[PDB]
Ligand binder design. Structure first.
Ligand SMILES: CC(=O)N[C@H]1[C@H](O[C@H]2[C@@H](O)[C@H](O)[C@@H](CO)O[C@@H]2O)O[C@H](CO)[C@@H](O)[C@@H]1O
Ligand SMILES: CC(=O)N[C@H]1[C@H](O[C@H]2[C@@H](O)[C@H](O)[C@@H](CO)O[C@@H]2O)O[C@H](CO)[C@@H](O)[C@@H]1O
Ligand SMILES: [Ca+2]
Ligand SMILES: [Ca+2]
Ligand SMILES: [Mn+2]
Ligand SMILES: [Mn+2]
Lengths: 240, 240
């Protein structure tokens, strides 16, 4: 299970409970979601994701319970370019999820090209930190960097303007309260600059009872590293 | 991960994070470790174990840390016989652990006959609730039902007298404090009767850095049900 929690203050190379997909790997005690060269610089055309191995019991039909969960994490982005891409996302998906074919670039390793905006063809809730929004390729994006809540589509149901700061860690808290059905996101830089975005969603009508949680990141023609530095998660089924 | 916790107030049929070995199965919201017939009556010659799927980081060589862990659980045993057998154990072992050939009966599904008392041939720490002690077959046991702490051998490094009570739940708390290296066990029945036993052990010299935790039970010629009713576990790496 009814409750599960785990904490990664850092990421040592000897991991046993993480599923690595695509180009994701541990380097310097952090997870590098997207590929880097020998010298450690970001490269184009790369997708990577990680999922915790134990499944999370998000809701239980037999008892009408739904989980209250909280995910706290920190990440930093670095790039030689003034317009690094494409972004990183915390996501919740069915357990057998895998990287969809062609999901690189602005699709963030989460959606397939042909169905990226079809809410009926996907099962995913994600919180994206999107740094690239050129309207010729990312047609669904507002025209500025942003944090968005994605419910079955790369076109966010709610966004807030955000500032990308090269090399600075962003601390994020994502919480879901089954009582109010509010998924709240609070992100802050060390100087106190804060961003907040929230959305009401009934997770029961979007995702199965059991899910896996993790992170995804991608770079298409433009690039930057997507470094996940720490991550804590706790979930508890509650009756509301 | 450095920290992991999970809680099973009950065990609904739909499980995803448990590894079932032998005859173990969920019935009536509890784990029946040993086989029961259609009526729910115990049968002879059965062994069953469950393990939590995620691996636990017990200690870390690179940082000299060792985990503080606590395992709380309740179980009940029932048998129409006057000498129900053989017992249930909470155990910690390497991740790839499987039921040893011939480990039924008094070996509790934990040891192989040929090496059951050879401390160099095993890697297991277990807390046993042993109800069968006939000196002619269970030659390593004291002559009364007992709680025992087993370190790489079925011959307990320590035992205390215990009373088997048919159909009554026993609540147990097992804790390990890495600073004192004490493994403490406290068990109570609902009328307040209490049993306590402690042992000092450096888990680093017995077990590998990553392990799995779970329960094992067996019945040989004599039998009884071994029903695990609830279980919560928490582990966190500490500087020591
Ligand atoms: C070379 C490459 O990886 N192309 C992927 C492409 O990337 C697009 C766009 O989506 C990105 O936002 C920008 C900046 O990195 O680069 C390209 O213009 O996205 C496709 C999905 O729409 C992927 O299938 C391609 O792999
Ligand atoms: C029939 C059977 O399962 N025999 C197992 C045997 O069981 C012994 C003893 O260990 C038990 O304590 C008692 C009470 O149940 O029954 C028999 O006397 O134990 C062997 C290991 O010592 C197993 O290999 C046998 O499978
Ligand atoms: Ca984008
Ligand atoms: Ca015995
Ligand atoms: Mn976007
Ligand atoms: Mn014994």
């Amino acid at each position: 299970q009814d409750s599960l929690s785990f904490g990664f203050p850092t990421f040592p190379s000897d991991q046993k409970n993480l599923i690595f997909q695509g180009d994701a790997q541990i380097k310097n005690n952090a997870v590098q979601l997207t590929k880097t060269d020998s010298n450690g610089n970001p490269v184009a055309s790369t997708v990577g994701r990680i999922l915790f191995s134990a499944q999370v019991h998000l809701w239980e039909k037999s008892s009408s319970r739904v989980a209250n969960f909280q995910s706290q994490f920190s990440f930093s982005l670095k790039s030689p370019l003034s317009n690094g891409a494409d972004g990183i996302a915390f996501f919740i998906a069915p357990p057998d999820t895998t990287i969809p074919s062609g999901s690189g670039g602005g699709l963030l390793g989460l959606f397939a090209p042909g169905t990226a905006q079809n809410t009926s063809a996907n099962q995913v809730i994600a919180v994206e930190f999107d740094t690239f929004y050129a309207q010729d390729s990312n047609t669904w994006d507002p025209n500025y960097p942003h944090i968005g809540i994605d419910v079955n589509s790369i076109r966010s149901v709610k966004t807030v303007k955000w500032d990308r700061r090269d090399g600075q860690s962003l601390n994020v808290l994502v919480t879901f309260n089954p009582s109010t059905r509010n998924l709240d996101v609070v992100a802050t830089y060390s100087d106190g600059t804060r961003y907040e975005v929230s959305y009401e969603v009934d997770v029961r009508s979007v995702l199965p009872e059991w899910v896996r949680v993790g992170f995804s990141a991608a770079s298409g023609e433009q690039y930057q590293t997507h470094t996940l530095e720490s991550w804590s998660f706790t979930s508890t089924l509650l009756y509301t």
